[PDB]
Amino acid sequence: MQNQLYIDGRFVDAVAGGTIDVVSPHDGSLITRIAAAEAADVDLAVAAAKRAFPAWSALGAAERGRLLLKLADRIEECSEELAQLESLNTGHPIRDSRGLDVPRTAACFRYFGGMADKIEGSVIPVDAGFLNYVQRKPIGVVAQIVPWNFPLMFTSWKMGPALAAGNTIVIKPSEITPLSTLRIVELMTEVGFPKGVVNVVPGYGHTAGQALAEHLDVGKIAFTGSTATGRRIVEASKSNLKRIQLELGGKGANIVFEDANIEAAVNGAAWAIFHNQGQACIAGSRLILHKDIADQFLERFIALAKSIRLGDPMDPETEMGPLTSALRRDRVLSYIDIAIEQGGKVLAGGKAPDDKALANGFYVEPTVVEAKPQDRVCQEEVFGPFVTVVRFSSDEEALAIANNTEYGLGSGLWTQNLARAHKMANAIHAGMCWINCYKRVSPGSPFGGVGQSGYGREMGFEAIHDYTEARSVWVNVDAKIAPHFKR
Amino acid sequence: MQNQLYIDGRFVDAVAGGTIDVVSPHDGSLITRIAAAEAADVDLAVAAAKRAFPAWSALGAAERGRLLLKLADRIEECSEELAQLESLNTGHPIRDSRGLDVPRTAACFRYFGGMADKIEGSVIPVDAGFLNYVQRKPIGVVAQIVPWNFPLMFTSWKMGPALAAGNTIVIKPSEITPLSTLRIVELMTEVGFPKGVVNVVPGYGHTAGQALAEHLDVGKIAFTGSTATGRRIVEASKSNLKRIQLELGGKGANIVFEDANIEAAVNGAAWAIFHNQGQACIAGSRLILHKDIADQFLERFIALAKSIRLGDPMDPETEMGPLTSALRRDRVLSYIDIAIEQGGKVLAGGKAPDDKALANGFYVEPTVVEAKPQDRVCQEEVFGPFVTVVRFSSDEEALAIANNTEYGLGSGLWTQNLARAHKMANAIHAGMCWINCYKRVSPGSPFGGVGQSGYGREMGFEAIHDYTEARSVWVNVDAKIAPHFKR
Numbered sequence: 010m011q012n013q014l015y016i017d018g019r020f021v022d023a024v025a026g027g028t029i030d031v032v033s034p035h036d037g038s039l040i041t042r043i044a045a046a047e048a049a050d051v052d053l054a055v056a057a058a059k060r061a062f063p064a065w066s067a068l069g070a071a072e073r074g075r076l077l078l079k080l081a082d083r084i085e086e087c088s089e090e091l092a093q094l095e096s097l098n099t100g101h102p103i104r105d106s107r108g109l110d111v112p113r114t115a116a117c118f119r120y121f122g123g124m125a126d127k128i129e130g131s132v133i134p135v136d137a138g139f140l141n142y143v144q145r146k147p148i149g150v151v152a153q154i155v156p157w158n159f160p161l162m163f164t165s166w167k168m169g170p171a172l173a174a175g176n177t178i179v180i181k182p183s184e185i186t187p188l189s190t191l192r193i194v195e196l197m198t199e200v201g202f203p204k205g206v207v208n209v210v211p212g213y214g215h216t217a218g219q220a221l222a223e224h225l226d227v228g229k230i231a232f233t234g235s236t237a238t239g240r241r242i243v244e245a246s247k248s249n250l251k252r253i254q255l256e257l258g259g260k261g262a263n264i265v266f267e268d269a270n271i272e273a274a275v276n277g278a279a280w281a282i283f284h285n286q287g288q289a290c291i292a293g294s295r296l297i298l299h300k301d302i303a304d305q306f307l308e309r310f311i312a313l314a315k316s317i318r319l320g321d322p323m324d325p326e327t328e329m330g331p332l333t334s335a336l337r338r339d340r341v342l343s344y345i346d347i348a349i350e351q352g353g354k355v356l357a358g359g360k361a362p363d364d365k366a367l368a369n370g371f372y373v374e375p376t377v378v379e380a381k382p383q384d385r386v387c388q389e390e391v392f393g394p395f396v397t398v399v400r401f402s403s404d405e406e407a408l409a410i411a412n413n414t415e416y417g418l419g420s421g422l423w424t425q426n427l428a429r430a431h432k433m434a435n436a437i438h439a440g441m442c443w444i445n446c447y448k449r450v451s452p453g454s455p456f457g458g459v460g461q462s463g464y465g466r467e468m469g470f471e472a473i474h475d476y477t478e479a480r481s482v483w484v485n486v487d488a489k490i491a492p493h494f495k496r
Numbered sequence: 497m498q499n500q501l502y503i504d505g506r507f508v509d510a511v512a513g514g515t516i517d518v519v520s521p522h523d524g525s526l527i528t529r530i531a532a533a534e535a536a537d538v539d540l541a542v543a544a545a546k547r548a549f550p551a552w553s554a555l556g557a558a559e560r561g562r563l564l565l566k567l568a569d570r571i572e573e574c575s576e577e578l579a580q581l582e583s584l585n586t587g588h589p590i591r592d593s594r595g596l597d598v599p600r601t602a603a604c605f606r607y608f609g610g611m612a613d614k615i616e617g618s619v620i621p622v623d624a625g626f627l628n629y630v631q632r633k634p635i636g637v638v639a640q641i642v643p644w645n646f647p648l649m650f651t652s653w654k655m656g657p658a659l660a661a662g663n664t665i666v667i668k669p670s671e672i673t674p675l676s677t678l679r680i681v682e683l684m685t686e687v688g689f690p691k692g693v694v695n696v697v698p699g700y701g702h703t704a705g706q707a708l709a710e711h712l713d714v715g716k717i718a719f720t721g722s723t724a725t726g727r728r729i730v731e732a733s734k735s736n737l738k739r740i741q742l743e744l745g746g747k748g749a750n751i752v753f754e755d756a757n758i759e760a761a762v763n764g765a766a767w768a769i770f771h772n773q774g775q776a777c778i779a780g781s782r783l784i785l786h787k788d789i790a791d792q793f794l795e796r797f798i799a800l801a802k803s804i805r806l807g808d809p810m811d812p813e814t815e816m817g818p819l820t821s822a823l824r825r826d827r828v829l830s831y832i833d834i835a836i837e838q839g840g841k842v843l844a845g846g847k848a849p850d851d852k853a854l855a856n857g858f859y860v861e862p863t864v865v866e867a868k869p870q871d872r873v874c875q876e877e878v879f880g881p882f883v884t885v886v887r888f889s890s891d892e893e894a895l896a897i898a899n900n901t902e903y904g905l906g907s908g909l910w911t912q913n914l915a916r917a918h919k920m921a922n923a924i925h926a927g928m929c930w931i932n933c934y935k936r937v938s939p940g941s942p943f944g945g946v947g948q949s950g951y952g953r954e955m956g957f958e959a960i961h962d963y964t965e966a967r968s969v970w971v972n973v974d975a976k977i978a979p980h981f982k983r
Contacts, residue, residue, distance in 0.1 A: 131957075133938060133940050133941045133956070134938075134940060135936075135938040135940070135941055136936075136938065139933070139936065141936075141938065141941050143941065143942055143956075144922075228947070236737070239737060240734035240737065241734075243730065243731075243733060243734040243737060244730075244731055244734055246730060247727040247728075247730050247731055249947070249948055250723070250726060250727065250730065250742055250744065250947075250948050250950055250951070252951045253740075255737060257737065273976065276979040276980070276981070279979070279980065279981055280979070280980035280981070283980075283981075284980050313981060316981075317981060328980075328981055430971065431969075434969045434971075435631075435967075435969075439967075440965065440966060440967065440968060441967075441968040441969070441970065442967070442968070442969050442970065443970040443972070444969070444970060444971045444972055445971070445972035445973075446626070446970060446972040446977075449622075449626065449970050451620060451622045451623070451628065453620045453621060453622070454620045454622060454628050454630070454968055454970075455620075455630055455966040455968050456968070457966065459965055459967070460715070460736070460737075461736055461737055463737060464737070464739045464965075466966050469620065469630075471966055474961065478927065478946050478951075479927065479942040479944065479953050479958055480926070480927060480928075480929070480946070481927065481928045481929070481941055481942050481943075482918075482921040482922075482928075482929045482930075482931065483928070483929065483930040483931060483933055483936045483941075484917065484931045484932070485930070485931060485932035485933035485936075488933065490760070490763070490764075490933065492763040492766070492767070493763070493766065493767040493770075493771055494763070494766055494767070494770075494800065494803070494804060494815055
């Protein structure tokens with residue numbers, strides 16, 4: 010199974026033969042060893058992307074579209090192999106690989122295939138005698154560093170828009186979850202993407218990541234990741250002042266009010282925090298329940314949590330799976346420990362499961378911690394199936410809590426009050442806000458953060474705006490121009 | 497003459513009482529001393545803007561528009577005052593301040609006063625039963641650092657879009673040319689802008705600049721200035737990962753092809769680099785002449801250059817004034833010297849005016865140097881009344897030269913060939929390209945750089961895009977879905 014760098018249309022090892030173990034979260038066993046790209050490997054990748062940019066950006070929006078469409082179809086056709094591949098590598102329940110990751114990946118690529126030739130410039134109302142027309146051109150060679158929570162689906166998200174616009178791409182998945190991205194670029198050539206238009210360069214953040222965020226021929230750096238590394242992606246941009254897209258995490262408020270449909274809210278909250286083992290920046294990791302329904306909500310929710318079938322990602326019966334790296338587990342258990350010493354009161358989970366089939370894997374039980382908005386764990390992104398419950402009394406207390414964070418990515422609330430719904434959505438500082446639903450994403454719906462959760466948008470024309478440049482051309486047609494210096 | 501900081505509707509001295517000398521470029525005499533702001537004052541400023549934001553962003557677009565519209569008018573009413581104030585301080589010919597600066601400043605504030613209630617969100621086609629609307633909200637408190645080349649006009653360029661979209665602003669003009677900006681904000685409160693909506697905070701760059709770029713409560717920093725100091729706006733932005741806009745200079749190609757209208761081209765070229773003493777990033781500082789018309793061209797151009805009325809900026813018949821700072825002067829002369837040490841051949845200019853009369857001012861003669869493209873004055877932005885001349889024989893030659901630079905702000909060419917015109921405009925890596933005209937700017941025509949000339953755009957819907965955020969709201973109304981966890 011593809012485990013090499015993919016540069017200029019070929020799978021190749023790292024120039025220096027570096028390697029990285031790719032392990033399966035189930036058991037911690039080795040899946041394969043992947044070629045680890047380093048600074049040298051990305052020069053090769055970037056030069057290939059640079060080499061390829063002209064025939065590609067000059068390719069005809071529609072033929073970049075037709076290829077992206079072709080890719081979506083191919084992904085679907087290969088949907089069980091990817092799913093399998095992505096679950097095995099990620100820990101995603103394959104019921105999640107099949108029904109979420111793969112379709113969402115295809116859907117996104119299909120969206121941007123039909124976007125490619127809908128990317129339009131404008132013609133400006135300027136002075137008489139002049140024609141001002143502004144193209145939207147590709148930036149050029151764009152770099153993209155993706156995290157490991159949605160390796161497969163985030164290829165769409167990142168690569169969808171960039172390719173549609175005609176940029177060439179050097180993309181760096183995490184050493185953690187590479188495999189499924191690598192297969193995707195092979196699907197890409199399978200379907201006719203020209204060599205070098207996309208190059209995949211898995212490697213450590215400090216080697217491949219850094220070469221990319223600082224490479225002088227990269228015009229944009231797209232980065233989804235930890236705030237900390239994102240400041241570092243920002244400092245690295247200094248190099249040539251490439252444009253930046255950062256998505257840097259969320260601490261998703263999930264508010265439930267007095268008149269919420271609590272069966273629906275419960276289901277939504279469960280999905281919102283436990284889907285993908287909570288490894289989603291838009292996860293509803295902060296339950297915020299109105300004191301007058303808290304107990305009723307919590308009766309069904311904790312039940313729900315406690316009943317989730319944690320286990321082998323390859324079982325079409327598994328509802329949850331392991332975290333993706335052993336490090337993150339620890340991290341998610343330290344957070345648990347710290348939610349506990351902070352006076353937190355575990356209602357479910359709290360620690361790694363007990364089953365013997367799960368003892369090698371990076372599993373953590375669907376935890377649920379009652380706390381105070383103040384607690385750490387209520388302020389920092391625990392990237393795991395870990396929600397905090399806090400309770401409120403006034404719309405205003407809820408807004409306060411929701412907005413009591415440095416994050417701004419996702420949000421959600423549950424009511425039936427027309428006013429309240431909009432008054433809160435309008436007032437929450439997040440880039441998105443779902444009401445009576447959660448973690449709802451569409452390829453046309455701008456997805457991104459606000460404040461310290463980042464800037465830039467994936468999805469929709471916005472994503473395309475982020476991957477193009479305005480190139481205004483003036484034509485002096487019948488213009489009367491007195492010399493500035495009269496004769 | 498207002499010479500204090502403007503914070504919270506108040507002219508006030510710097511906390512530390514630090515002060516800067518503001519000098520006439522003509523005779524280097526003291527016009528006044530300005531309150532030098534530093535970190536303390538930019539916190540008072542940013543704080544005032546933060547306080548002001550909520551009520552301002554809630555103003556309802558028409559009402560911020562109405563205020564921007566009143567400002568334009570008011571600016572036009574105080575046109576000679578502003579014109580005189582800006583010339584005195586900057587070195588601009590008052591015929592420039594009154595015919596260019598002032599009118600372009602109002603034009604742009606007008607444009608954006610009517611742009612205010614035309615800033616629209618979108619409704620996305622999402623799955624059935626969902627309503628997805630995406631508002632465009634203001635970022636919040638916006639920091640803006642402007643250079644000294646168009647103090648007045650750049651107030652409109654930066655503050656126009658930002659205000660329209662409902663941000664509040666802390667603007668920092670240069671210690672070198674604050675006076676115009678200061679009168680503008682009074683012009684603002686004069687007209688009804690609420691206190692703290694705009695705060696002006698002139699100060700050195702490493703003081704008030706640094707502090708603006710690093711501020712935690714600033715959501716975006718817009719910078720026009722050198723490439724050097726831009727990397728350190730970028731390096732500062734990490735603090736809170738505020739969005740950035742950069743315009744970092746130009747080395748404007750002005751290509752003249754064999755079938756150009758050489759009288760027109762000469763006037764354009766003269767305007768392109770000698771207007772504003774060449775202190776314009778979109779200056780046509782690199783004349784690229786087709787070998788067949790280069791002699792015909794240079795004949796009329798060098799006679800022009802030498803005919804140019806260098807002198808007292810307050811003379812409306814002055815054609816060119818001094819550079820606005822003694823340092824600029826010194827640097828431009830250095831460039832001249834190095835232009836020549838390099839084998840450059842000065843065809844006009846090459847030093848300060850032999851006019852005992854212009855001896856105290858920072859004057860430099862309209863300078864024209866025959867050079868190579870490899871030369872440094874041909875690669876580096878001089879930022880004075882200085883054009884280098886190079887010759888070519890092919891379109892492809894001309895393109896190569898035009899693009900043989902790190903810059904990519906403006907560009908321009910002269911022909912009557914249809915193809916050529918577009919082929920070249922489409923092939924020049926610049927944000928803007930003028931054909932048979934140059935330095936043509938309109939409030940609706942996106943203005944900005946590409947590559948290391950930066951990113952972001954001023955003017956137009958684009959400028960508005962750069963000062964808003966996507967706020968995606970999802971409402972579940974009529975179509976629900978099945979638990980992720982089926983019981």
